Structures are given as structure tokens and as C-alpha cells.
Amino acid sequence: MIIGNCLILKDFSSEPFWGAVEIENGTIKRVLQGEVKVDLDLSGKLVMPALFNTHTHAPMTLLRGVAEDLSFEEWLFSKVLPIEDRLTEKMAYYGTILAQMEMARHGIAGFVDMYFHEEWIAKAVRDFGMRALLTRGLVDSNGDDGGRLEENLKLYNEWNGFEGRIFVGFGPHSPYLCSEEYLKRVFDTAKSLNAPVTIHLYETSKEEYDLEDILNIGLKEVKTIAAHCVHLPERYFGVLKDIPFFVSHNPASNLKLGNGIAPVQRMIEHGMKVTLGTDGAASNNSLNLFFEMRLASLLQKAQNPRNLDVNTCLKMVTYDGAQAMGFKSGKIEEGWNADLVVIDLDLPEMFPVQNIKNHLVHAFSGEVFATMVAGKWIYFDGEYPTIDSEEVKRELARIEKELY
Numbered sequence: 405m406i407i408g409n410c411l412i413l414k415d416f417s418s419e420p421f422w423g424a425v426e427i428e429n430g431t432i433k434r435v436l437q438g439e440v441k442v443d444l445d446l447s448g449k450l451v452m453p454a455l456f457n458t459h460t461h462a463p464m465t466l467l468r469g470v471a472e473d474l475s476f477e478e479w480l481f482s483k484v485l486p487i488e489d490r491l492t493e494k495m496a497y498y499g500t501i502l503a504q505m506e507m508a509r510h511g512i513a514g515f516v517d518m519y520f521h522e523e524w525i526a527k528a529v530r531d532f533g534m535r536a537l538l539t540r541g542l543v544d545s546n547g548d549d550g551g552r553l554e555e556n557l558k559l560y561n562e563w564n565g566f567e568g569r570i571f572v573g574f575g576p577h578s579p580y581l582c583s584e585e586y587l588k589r590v591f592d593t594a595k596s597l598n599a600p601v602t603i604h605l606y607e608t609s610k611e612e613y614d615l616e617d618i619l620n621i622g623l624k625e626v627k628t629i630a631a632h633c634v635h636l637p638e639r640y641f642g643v644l645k646d647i648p649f650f651v652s653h654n655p656a657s658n659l660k661l662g663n664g665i666a667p668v669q670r671m672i673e674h675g676m677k678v679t680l681g682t683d684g685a686a687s688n689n690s691l692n693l694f695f696e697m698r699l700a701s702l703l704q705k706a707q708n709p710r711n712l713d714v715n716t717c718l719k720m721v722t723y724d725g726a727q728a729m730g731f732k733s734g735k736i737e738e739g740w741n742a743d744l745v746v747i748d749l750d751l752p753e754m755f756p757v758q759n760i761k762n763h764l765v766h767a768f769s770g771e772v773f774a775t776m777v778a779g780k781w782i783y784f785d786g787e788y789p790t791i792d793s794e795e796v797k798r799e800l801a802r803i804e805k806e807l808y
């Protein structure tokens with residue numbers, strides 16, 4: 405398939421140019437320049453790499469707006485846990501379909517998940533069309549995890565590598581909900597299976613433990629997506645630079661739950677790899693990485709207007725996120741995955757046209773025209789070609805009545 409006759413943004417460091425993109429077998433066969441014969445004329449629009457959300461809890465879309473004006477401890481143990489106790493397998497599936505509907509409308513091609521009923525979340529990802537690194541949330545009590553690691557292993561056995569779109573990793577919740585012995589066991593397991601780990605790290609100010617413990621259990625040799633890192637001591641930035649450590653910056657959630665602002669600019673200046681995540685819809689309420697990216701840029705600029713430039717922001721939301729997830733995406737080049745997004749330039753916020761890249765970060769509404777993954781359209785002009793919208797909406801309505 406050849407889509408083009410419009411502006412093309414190869415990557416975060418490139419300039420938009422008029423051309424087209426030829427896709428075959430889910431990959432980019434070649435990038436054409438200028439006036440060329442195309443199958444799909446997208447004149448008046450922009451084609452760029454798709455985005456990658458490095459932190460979420462997909463089914464939480466079913467809890468959007470249920471836990472407001474609460475501190476973290478109240479949010480989790482008072483409001484969220486009781487409701488999650490009623491969240492069924494069927495609900496996990498549809499909640500994930502809903503999460504993908506929302507994320508796809510914002511140009512997201514893949515996401516990293518940490519939750520339960522992960523097999524049904526995987527089925528939803530399979531059916532909808534996105535890519536994903538799925539992990540099971542792990543917590544324990546003196547080594548007893550109620551079978552959570554076992555469930556994560558079942559998930560791995562059945563879904564890791566599925567269609568080159570789904571990968572499986574391990575999701576220890578945090579260094580405080582996981583005992584030291586158990587966290588070590590989780591890392592040993594991930595290391596043995598050469599699988600990634602994702603965890604909430606230094607999200608709250610109460611977390612004052614030393615990172616040496618985790619640095620000696622496998623953090624150096626296991627690809628780890630560390631969400632938040634708001635209170636991560638700067639003395640560790642240097643050692644985290646040359647290891648497969650990816651920060652997942654969740655600005656909205658960090659503010660909403662009163663945790664603060666992560667020192668992203670300093671982390672980047674130290675050579676650390678940083679990506680963007682949304683967290684769940686109950687503590688952000690939106691699953692929009694454009695919003696997340698923009699907010700991130702603004703928060704760092706509070707200290708210095710030169711912080712987080714446009715190219716760096718675009719790099720984090722596309723290439724860096726794909727890198728964290730282990731996918732050859734984030735750039736429109738030959739041999740790379742056909743994960744692309746189309747943005748309408750015929751909008752007030754996209755003028756002057758000579759500043760398109762800047763608008764993507766500081767003005768763009770966030771609503772894309774279309775999203776493609778593996779060469780397939782998962783969102784196009786307000787519609788979801790891979791699912792039965794009416795059916796899904798009816799099921800979601802029944803779920804709201806059933807859950808609440």
C-alpha cells in the first residue's frame with residue numbers, strides 16, 4: 405500500500421517533506437519523495453511515526469473518574485482495590501478494547517501494561533490490533549504472592565511473541581509492595597527468560613530506600629521500564645545511563661496524586677533514557693500521549709524555558725518508547741515497522757504551517773486523523789475498522805450497570 409502526496413516526518417530530528425510511504429507485509433518498503441502515484445492521497449495532512457505509551461493499566465478505563473480528590477494511599481486502598489475486586493475477565497477485555505479505542509485516537513500504536521486478567525487484556529490487544537508489552541502486577545507478603553508470578557508465567561508461555569505485536573514481561577508493583585526477597589526472585593525470573601521488568605519506582609516521597617539493593621539483583625542486566633522516578637536520587641543518574649533502564653515519565657498522574665514533578669531534564673542531561681506513560685485512567689483519566697508529552701515539556705520549562713525542546717519531546721514519545729518496548733518503530737525508514745499516524749494540518753492550531761513540529765508539541769489538540777500498526781488501520785477518520793463499535797459500546801454500557 406502506498407500512502408502519500410502529503411507532508412512526511414521521518415523522525416524526531418527530521419524536517420517535514422512532501423512525499424509518500426510504501427508499506428508491505430507490515431513494514432516500510434521505501435520512502436518516496438515528491439509527487440508520486442499513491443493508493444491513498446492524504447494531501448493536506450501529515451504522516452509521522454506512531455506513539456508508544458510506556459505505562460498504563462488498561463482496564464482502568466472502567467474506573468475513569470471514580471477516585472478523585474484523594475491522596476495516593478486513599479486512592480489505592482480505599483477506592484480502587486474494592487472496585488478491582490469486582491472487575492471480571494470479560495470486563496478486562498472490554499476495558500482494554502476501550503483503552504485502545506482512546507489511545508488509537510491519539511496516535512498510540514503500542515503500550516506497556518501492568519495489571520491482572522492479563523490473558524483477556526492480551527485477547528483484546530490481539531483483536532484490536534495494537535502492539536503491547538504486557539505484564540502481570542506482582543505483590544507479595546513474605547514471599548507469598550497468591551500465585552501472581554505463576555499467572556505472569558502462564559501469560560508469557562501463551563502470549564510472548566504473538567504476531568510480533570505482543571511481548572510479555574514481569575510487573576512487580578514497587579519496591580515497597582514487593583519484599584526484597586520476592587523482588588529478587590522476580591528479577592531472577594525475568595533475567596532467566598530474557599524478559600523485561602516494569603515497576604513503579606520512587607513514585608512517592610515516602611520512598612527513601614537505596615537503589616543499590618535493586619542494582620545488585622539484576623537491574624543492570626534486565627531491561628527495566630521504571631515508571632515515575634519522581635523521587636529518584638540524582639546520585640544514581642550516572643549509573644543508570646549505561647544500562648537498559650528506561651524511565652516512564654507519567655506527568656499527569658504525578659501531579660494528580662500529589663507526588664510532584666520528576667526531574668526529567670536532569671535525567672536526560674545525564675544520558676538517561678526517558679519515555680512517556682499515561683498510567684491508568686483513574687489517576688489521569690485520559691490516555692493521550694500527546695497531552696502527556698506537552699505537559700512534560702511545560703513542567704520542565706517551569707525551571708528553564710529551554711528545557712525539553714520539541715525534538716526531544718517527539719523522540720521520547722516515538723522512538724524511545726518503541727525502544728523501551730523492544731519494537732523496531734519510531735522512524736519512517738526502510739525495514740522499520742509500519743506503525744504510523746496521520747494528523748490533519750487543516751486545523752487552526754496547526755498554523756503557521758512553517759512551524760508544524762512545534763505545533764505537534766505545544767498546540768496540537770491530540771486528536772489524530774488515523775493510526776496504523778503493522779500496516780493495518782486501527783483508527784481512521786473517527787472509526788475503528790478492527791472492531792464492532794456498536795457491539796463494544798453496548799457491552800460497555802452493560803458493564804457500567806454491572807460494575808456500579
Ligand code: MET
Pocket residue numbers: 461518519520540541542543552577
Ligand atoms: C497493577 S496490578 C497490582 C496488583 C493487584 N492490586 C492485585 O491484587 O493483583
Ligand code: NI
Pocket residue numbers: 459460461604631683684
Ligand atoms: Ni501505575
